[PDB]
């Protein structure tokens, strides 16, 4: 029985995009004081037309009406040590992404809003409801997430810490694990002005999204960038230095979503000099942004997401797997580097699949 069970939120004002209740899937582990709260990813929408299209063909990302009663935990959400060497005995929570707002929104469906964008409030409400289901006894709350959910970790981890402090639980240690959500606002390989969804670069799409969602960002980052510039806080290398909670960053050096938003579409044809240099510079820039991130795992592979994949234990950087690096991170946060137990693991080779342990794509 690997199953997490669905609970729809008791506060029915906290909703998915279409006004159906948001929710969470939970598998308790009696007697563990560790809680893993995972934020699903799945891109985002930023205006009426592209949200309407998402509602037709990605409806589970906008509504709870068709969610199943259970889900199987995989990767870091597995309860089997064979699959999850890191946290197999933890309390497991999977929070479906049904707000299409990179977990940033704070707006309800109303006479002026066709859709609700409540991602930031969904996280707060899940935490509130879990406190009565055992989270009050926690020693560590790891807020994890992949893709848009990894960016969601960066945007929300300090708010979870603040919420728990204000509710009277200052002993729960809040930490973040951001997988595949560390994007660059870099020069694109080909460029289009923002005239529709597919042509709109991330900085422009997110600047529009924040206004459409009533998006919120972490306070220290908001104070740096100020009004109109909060889109900056969606880029990991800019928001990370403002955060107080410990955050472990997992990012492929050649992330497929980064390449997509850079207008790079590989085709198996030979790569010529311009694109070769572009890809190599992308890996170098990503590595440079991680230079001062002490807890990080960044393999030289063309891929996207890792922590909820069943074979997540297979990739290694410098001979260390991700479950090992996460364990070393836990040790480093006990009340000086550790012999043979590294936490900063960034590949230096310059081309996808120069690391032989990269996912095969099979
Ligand atoms: C939060 C964020 C900041 C910066 C960059 C990306 C970010 O989120 C992920 C993202 O945009 N993902 C996708 C996924 C599929 C796509 C297909 N076609 C075009 C664009 C697409 C974009
Ligand atoms: C329900 O959620 C809304 C929106 O986040 C919040 O303002 C309200 O206080 C919540 N109600 C309760 C009882 O928690």
From Swiss-Prot:
GO terms for molecular function: palmitoleyl hydrolase activity; phospholipase C activity; protein-containing complex destabilizing activity. Induction: Up-regulated in hepatocellular carcinoma (HCC) with high intracellular beta-catenin. Glycans are attached at residue 11. It is an enzyme of class 3 (hydrolase). Changing residue 147 to A: Abolishes enzyme activity. Unable to mediate serine depalmitoleoylation of WNT proteins. It catalyses: [Wnt protein]-O-(9Z)-hexadecenoyl-L-serine + H2O = [Wnt protein]-L-serine + (9Z)-hexadecenoate + H(+). Its EC number is 3.1.1.98. Its main location: secreted. One of its GO terms (cellular component) is extracellular region. The active site is at residues 147, 255, 304. It is found in: Secreted. GO terms for biological process: bone development; negative regulation of canonical Wnt signaling pathway; negative regulation of Wnt signaling pathway; protein depalmitoleylation; regulation of bone mineralization; Wnt signaling pathway. Carboxylesterase that acts as a key negative regulator of the Wnt signaling pathway by specifically mediating depalmitoleoylation of WNT proteins. Serine palmitoleoylation of WNT proteins is required for efficient binding to frizzled receptors. Belongs to the pectinacetylesterase family. Notum subfamily. This is Palmitoleoyl-protein carboxylesterase NOTUM. The gene is NOTUM.
């Amino acid at each position: 029985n690997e199953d997490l069970r669905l609970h729809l939120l008791l506060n029915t004002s906290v909703t998915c995009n279409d006004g159906s209740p948001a929710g969470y899937y939970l598998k308790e582990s009696r007697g563990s004081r560790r809680w893993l709260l995972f934020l699903e990813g799945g891109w985002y929408c930023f205006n009426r037309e592209n949200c309407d299209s998402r509602y037709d063909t990605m409806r589970r990302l906008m509504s709870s009406r068709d969610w199943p009663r259970t889900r199987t935990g995989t990767g870091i959400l597995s309860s089997q040590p064979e699959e999850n060497p890191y946290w197999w005995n933890a309390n497991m929570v999977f929070i479906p992404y049904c707000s299409s707002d990179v977990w940033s929104g704070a707006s309800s469906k109303s006479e002026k809003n066709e859709y609700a964008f409540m991602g930031a409030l969904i996280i707060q409400e899940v935490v509130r409801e879990l406190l009565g289901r055992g989270l009050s006894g926690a020693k560590v709350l790891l807020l994890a997430g992949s893709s848009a959910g990894g960016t969601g970790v960066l945007l929300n981890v300090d708010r979870v810490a603040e919420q728990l402090e204000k509710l009277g639980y200052p002993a729960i240690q809040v930490r973040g694990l951001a997988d595949s959500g560390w994007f660059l606002d870099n020069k694109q390989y080909r460029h289009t002005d923002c005239v529709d969804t597919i042509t709109c670069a991330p900085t422009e799409a997110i600047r529009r999204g924040i206004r459409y969602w009533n998006g919120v960002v972490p306070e220290r980052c908001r104070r740096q960038f100020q009004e109109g510039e909060e889109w900056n806080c969606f880029f990991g290398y800019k928001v990370y230095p403002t955060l107080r909670s410990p955050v472990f960053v997992v990012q492929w050096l050649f992330d497929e979503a980064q390449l997509t938003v850079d207008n790079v579409h590989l085709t198996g044809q030979p790569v010529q000099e311009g694109l070769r240099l572009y890809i190599q510079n992308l890996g170098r820039e990503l590595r440079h942004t991680l230079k001062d991130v002490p807890a990080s795992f960044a393999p030289a592979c063309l891929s996207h997401e890792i922590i909820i994949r069943s074979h997540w234990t297979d990739v290694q950087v410098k001979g260390t797997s991700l479950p090992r690096a996460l364990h070393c991170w836990d040790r480093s946060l006990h009340d000086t580097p550790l012999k043979g137990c590294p936490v900063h693991l960034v590949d230096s080779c310059p081309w996808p699949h120069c690391n032989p342990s990269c996912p095969t794509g099979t």
